[PDB]
Design a protein around this ligand. Structure first.
Ligand SMILES: Nc1ncnc2c1ncn2[C@@H]1O[C@H](COP(=O)(O)OP(=O)(O)NP(=O)(O)O)[C@@H](O)[C@H]1O
Ligand SMILES: [Mg+2]
Lengths: 616, 7, 495, 160
């Protein structure tokens, strides 16, 4: 069944690509010209000569060929969908293809036959296989895809069944979608209104069966929203801690039995009943400020087990992009685990749960047991550079020089950058040396660090992550694996900033020196090549994950009155994945070498933002 | 001074 | 498979080992056969003698052709010319009688006999040369005669040429072994190295990589590296490239370039031509593998080789003009491939979608500028991405134009004084008639390409005569230059 | 290449021939080495015993692991069990002591020793099965156990 489905899907994709090519457009234009010429020749009384008969016969042959091609494509699509349904009805080892089924169901919602077959045969498919793509299904309630009411009703029924089966992983997404304007209400096109109405219908349908759980979850969500909307601009000068005022419902919100903590991942099982999950017991009465213009809030929650868990509520910011980033991170980690080449290398991506709560607010899981790179390296008091190289230039001197040179030209900037790099040697290589005395553990941590750096750099280049200064990367004190925490701007946003980002990922001297004596050559290059090969093999899944846009655009886009910038970033990501760019073909090794050259080029580092700490 | 390039 | 009888299975195994470049392993395997099997059949004994003389195993002691050849080689090493000549005569008689006894009727059967007789004649010539003394002029004339004969044997199969090359290598090794220390030893060493590199290309062209590796190993055993790398390092790089070891070959060639460009000092024109060849090879390898963008590698290698060849062309030798033509052809092919790739990318549906998005951005920016609206983050982002897209499109168009101009100019340069590269003229037309709208290419065609010989356009004469229509409005200059070229061609070849 | 010393060059050649599927050619090459070279070093002798037991070359006649394995196989073929069990015990003791004498500190070094001990245990199980008689159920259970263990060895390297 899997072989037949893969063959049918490949044939359908090939036919679709052929139809979308410029050759098909030229053939269609020629066919239209032939049709209009035949029409004019029939309207006017003209004798049938050799040319007229030839034109009519070639037109008939072209029409027959086009009709046969369309029928064959439709039959291939139907066969692929049917074989996917048959394989997933009683299959367990082939559960990774469900995305492809969605890629063949949501993109072809206009056909009634496939929707009917999905609602007839695929209605019995287990609901635990759609959890990774639950957000994608919940993002398709818009009416822009007019393919009849049958597709909408079957999608709504499937979503309701999935939510009933697994309320833990479903209610949060629906409530976040329905709370786009909750911030304005507590303190908008036709598509948004329709999506909100559908989300409200889903919420009421779920609450008809589980009223207490739904009401508790929505009360917790409202408490989080009102906490995020709280104005803390008067507490910007306090760092020890500020007591939350008693008027907030979060303080009085305690003793939750049917509510599971959102910031902690839940190991989903095949049973619809959960009785061994950590719930919410109490909330701390003090919160801390993490700094910044937006003033994010840090809270601590005590669960049923009594272990305190730290959460970061980020008001006045959209974490939907960060949610997509975390989802694609998990997808990449799963793909790396599935591949036997990368499974042996133990290539993994460190991920932390991010739960959107509204269009302009959300929460995320705080990373514990990690220390900032800049705090370890360029600390004013006990920095590594000062401790190891007192004679070298201090961080303050480098910052002063960078501030004084930003008003100069390219030549002066390059000269001062070279002079700074001359009198500033990497010191990061001693990190594991000062934390793992045992040579075996030291080398294991170093290898894990190198592999994590390679994988993270590759994924960041693919996703266009640009905000990669010292404060956005946290190094673990035990596993020594870098974790990306900010993710504030991505998708090639650094070029939009006044200082363009000339590098795809952070590959400064400190990182390279900490990778070992071999530098970029060796483990880093091979790991990058393996990750690039895996991404080239799973471009289909990557595009399926990233295509959540064009239906529910996030904030900061489509303002000031098929999304423009969403289509642009999808095209850019497709070009990066296929290695086409401006029509040029690049191998995985060549692409890796080009990325390394761009990252380690001092010319690109000179033009970077002085606060990015390129020399560090 | 802020590390990230705000706006 | 053990079902095959041992009469031919052992011969097949020995032949496979010989063609796999394994000599010592074959010798030990044959010694094991001698240990386990007492009596020797004529076929296995002949193979034993072949391996003995090919591997210079002088320790091992009618007669077959290989036995006679080994005996003649041993006599030559022992300075016993009488038995050497007698053995060669007996081998010739035996080969002739064995060849003529059969029914013949097949040309392909004559090739092994012709190869064996050619080997015997070459050994006769070597014996005549070594009869009393060896001089530089005699060695040079022998080597040029051998090179001429090999050129006559270009169309022959590798199976009939491998014994000849092996015998030549053995002869050169024997002469090196029994040569007194003087400049004659250096001349014989250079001749041996040149013969080994010619064998390396000969085996590389026949999809063989073990024999070239053995030749390079012998060169490294005899020749030694120095500050100035010789021409056999490039051959080693090519051999490693043929073994799917692209990284090692690229590293070796980059090291060669780094050594050459820093310590050239115009020491020898041979060094200049081998530097140009190495630059061309590196450019071709980077173009094929695409480890870097064309913009930097093109200027680093292809133009550097072109200018190096053109700055010291005061001798007008064949060994320089052929290299210059090869470099010009490589540069022209790279430029044409890049231009075709850019044109295909521009004609794809992705380019059309990008153009539609750019037009939408342009119209949105126009409406935002017409109406007084404050500049928010979205407007700034849209304006900046529009500016970046416009800059990228302009850069791509300029790069495509420069690639087209470079390709046309390199075609003109190659065809001005080239004969072996006359099949590319069509491509030049494909890059001239399809781009008649550009005045620069037409002017360069009428300025530099006006002296191109008119006998190279005869196959495409009809194509040129079919382009006088005015539907291709690209100025009167293209029409007048086309008419002048057609008139000149007609005057030269009215038939 | 002839610059490599013959101490490891011969071992590398024999290993390459083993990994290339060549058995009879390897046997003849080793016979040629025996003819040209009289004395046998421990490494080449161990490789000789490995080729002898792997190729079922029963004609060829402390002891290494491969020597002990070949002796145990020959004893099993001769319906002798006392010397077979003693040879397996000696091989186990030798492997354990050789493994524990070094500095260890590397997991990858444990894999060859684990593979050798697993081979010895499999030979012990075969000897126990063949001690008095063979039945269909015993062979079936031995094969299903072997298949299960091989499933446990899916992630292991092909060399081990
Ligand atoms: N997952 C996380 N774990 C730990 N600390 C975090 C995490 N995410 C953010 N921080 C910290 O939060 C502070 C800044 O908040 P952040 O989430 O980066 O949004 P931000 O204020 O916009 N940062 P910036 O982009 O520089 O303005 C820094 O001190 C970070 O170290
Ligand atoms: Mg940040």
């Amino acid at each position: 069944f899997l072989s037949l489905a893969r063959f049918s899907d490949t044939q359908y994709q090939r036919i679709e690509n052929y139809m979308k090519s410029s050759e098909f457009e030229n053939k269609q234009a020629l066919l239209k010209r032939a049709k209009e010429e035949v029409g004019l020749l029939r309207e006017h009384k003209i004798q049938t000569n050799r040319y007229t008969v030839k034109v009519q016969r070639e037109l008939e042959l072209d029409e027959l060929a086009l009709r046969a091609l369309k029928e064959d494509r439709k039959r291939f699509l139907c066969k692929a969908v049917e074989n996917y349904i048959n394989c997933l009805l009683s299959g367990e080892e082939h559960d990774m293809w469900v995305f492809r089924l969605c890629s063949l169901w949501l993109e072809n919602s206009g056909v009634s036959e496939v929707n009917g077959m999905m609602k007839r045969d695929g209605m019995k498919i287990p609901t635990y296989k759609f959890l990774p793509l639950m957000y994608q299904l919940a993002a398709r309630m818009g009416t822009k895809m007019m393919g009849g009411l049958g597709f909408h009703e079957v999608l709504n029924n499937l979503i309701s069944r999935i939510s009933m089966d697994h309320p833990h992983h479903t209610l949060f997404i629906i409530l976040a979608l329905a709370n786009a304007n909750r911030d304005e209400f507590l303190t908008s096109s036709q598509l948004d209104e329709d999506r909100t109405e559908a989300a409200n219908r889903i919420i009421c349908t779920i609450r008809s069966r589980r009223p207490q759980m739904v009401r508790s979850v929505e009360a917790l969500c409202d408490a989080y929203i009102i906490l995020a909307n709280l104005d803390a601009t008067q507490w910007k000068t306090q760092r020890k801690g500020i007591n939350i005022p008693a008027d907030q419902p979060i303080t009085k919100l305690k003793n939750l039995e049917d509510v599971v903590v959102p910031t902690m991942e839940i190991k989903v099982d095949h049973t619809g009943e959960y009785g061994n999950l950590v719930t919410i017991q109490s909330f701390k009465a003090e919160f801390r400020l993490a700094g910044g213009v937006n003033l994010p809030k840090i809270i601590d929650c005590v669960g049923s087990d009594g272990k305190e868990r730290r959460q970061l509520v980020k008001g006045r910011d959209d974490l939907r992009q960060d949610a997509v980033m975390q989802q694609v991170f998990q997808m990449c980690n799963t793909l790396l685990q599935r591949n036997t080449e990368t499974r042996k290398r133990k290539l993994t991506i460190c991920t932390y749960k991010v739960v959107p709560l509204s269009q302009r607010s959300g929460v995320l899981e705080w990373c514990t047991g990690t220390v900032p790179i800049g705090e370890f390296l360029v600390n004013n008091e006990d920095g590594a550079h000062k401790r190891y190289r007192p004679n070298d230039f201090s961080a303050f001197q480098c910052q002063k020089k960078m501030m004084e040179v930003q008003k100069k030209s390219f030549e002066e900037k390059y000269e001062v950058f070279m002079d700074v790099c001359q009198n500033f040697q990497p010191v990061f290589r001693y990190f594991c040396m000062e934390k793992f005395l045992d040579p075996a553990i030291w080398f294991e941590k170093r290898l894990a660090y190198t592999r994590s750096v390679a994988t993270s750099s590759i994924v960041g280049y693919i996703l266009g992550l640009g905000d990669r200064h010292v404060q956005n990367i946290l190094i673990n004190e035990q596993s020594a694996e870098l974790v990306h925490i900010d993710l504030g701007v991505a998708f090639e946003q650094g070029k939009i900033l006044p200082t363009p980002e000339t590098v795809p990922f952070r590959l400064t001297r400190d990182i390279v020196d900490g990778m070992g004596i071999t530098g970029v050559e060796g483990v880093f290059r091979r790991c990058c090549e393996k990750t690039m090969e895996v991404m080239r093999n799973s471009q289909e899944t990557l595009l399926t994950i990233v295509e959540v846009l064009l239906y529910d655009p996030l904030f900061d886009w489509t303002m000031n009155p098929f999304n423009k910038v969403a289509e642009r970033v999808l095209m850019r990501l497709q070009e990066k994945l296929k290695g086409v760019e401006e029509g040029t073909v690049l191998s995985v090794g060549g692409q890796v070498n080009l990325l390394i050259q761009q990252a380690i080029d001092p010319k690109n580092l000179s033009r970077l933002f002085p606060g990015w700490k390129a020399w560090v | 001074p802020p590390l990230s390039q705000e706006t | 498979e053990t079902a095959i009888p041992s009469s031919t299975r052992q011969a097949g195994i020995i032949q496979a080992l010989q063609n796999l470049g394994l000599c010592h392993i074959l010798s030990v395997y044959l010694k094991g056969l001698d240990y386990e099997n007492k009596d020797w059949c004529p076929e296995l004994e002949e193979l034993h003698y072949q391996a003995a003389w090919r591997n210079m195993q002088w320790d091992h002691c009618g007669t077959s052709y290989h036995e006679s050849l080994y005996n003649a080689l041993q006599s030559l090493r022992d300075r016993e010319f009488s038995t050497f000549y007698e053995s060669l005569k007996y081998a010739r008689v035996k080969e002739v009688e064995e060849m003529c006894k059969r029914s013949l009727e097949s040309v392909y059967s004559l090739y092994p006999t012709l190869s064996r007789l050619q080997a015997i004649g070459e050994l006769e010539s070597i014996g005549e040369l070594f009869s009393r003394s060896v001089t530089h002029r005699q060695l040079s004339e022998v080597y040029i005669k051998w090179q001429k004969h090999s050129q006559l044997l270009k169309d022959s199969d590798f199976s009939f040429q491998e014994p000849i090359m092996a015998l030549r290598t053995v002869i050169l090794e024997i002469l090196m072994e029994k040569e007194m220390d003087n400049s004659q030893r250096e001349c014989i060493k250079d001749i041996l190295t040149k013969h080994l590199v010619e064998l390396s290309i000969l085996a590389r062209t026949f999809k063989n990589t073990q024999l070239p590796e053995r030749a390079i190993f012998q060169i490294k055993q005899y020749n030694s590296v120095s500050c100035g790398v010789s021409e056999w390092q490039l051959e080693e790089a090519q051999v490693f490239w043929a073994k799917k070891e692209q990284s090692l070959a690229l590293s070796i060639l980059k090291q060669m370039i780094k050594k050459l460009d820093a310590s050239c000092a115009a020491n020898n024109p041979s060094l200049k031509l081998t530097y140009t060849e190495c630059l061309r090879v590196c450019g071709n390898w980077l173009a094929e593998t695409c480890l870097e963008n064309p913009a930097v590698i093109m200027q680093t290698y292809l133009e550097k080789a072109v200018e190096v060849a053109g700055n010291y062309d005061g001798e007008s030798s064949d060994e320089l003009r052929n290299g210059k033509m090869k470099a010009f052809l490589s540069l022209a092919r790279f430029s044409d491939t890049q231009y075709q790739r850019i044109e295909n990318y521009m004609k794809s549906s992705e380019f059309e979608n990008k153009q539609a998005l750019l037009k939408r951005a342009k119209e949105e920016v126009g409406l935002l500028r017409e109406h007084k609206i404050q500049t928010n983050r979205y407007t700034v982002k849209v304006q900046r991405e529009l500016e970046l897209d416009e800059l990228a499109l302009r850069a791509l168009k300029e790069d495509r134009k420069r690639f087209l101009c470079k390709a046309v100019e390199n075609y003109i340069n190659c065809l001005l004084s080239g004969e072996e590269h006359d099949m590319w003229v069509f491509r030049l037309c494909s890059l001239w008639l399809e781009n008649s709208g550009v005045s620069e290419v037409n002017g360069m065609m009428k300025r530099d390409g006006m002296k191109i010989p008119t006998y190279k356009f005869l196959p495409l004469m009809y194509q040129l005569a079919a382009r006088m229509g005015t539907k291709m409005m690209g100025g009167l200059g293209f029409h007048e230059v086309l008419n002048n070229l057609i008139s000149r061609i007609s005057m030269d070849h009215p038939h």
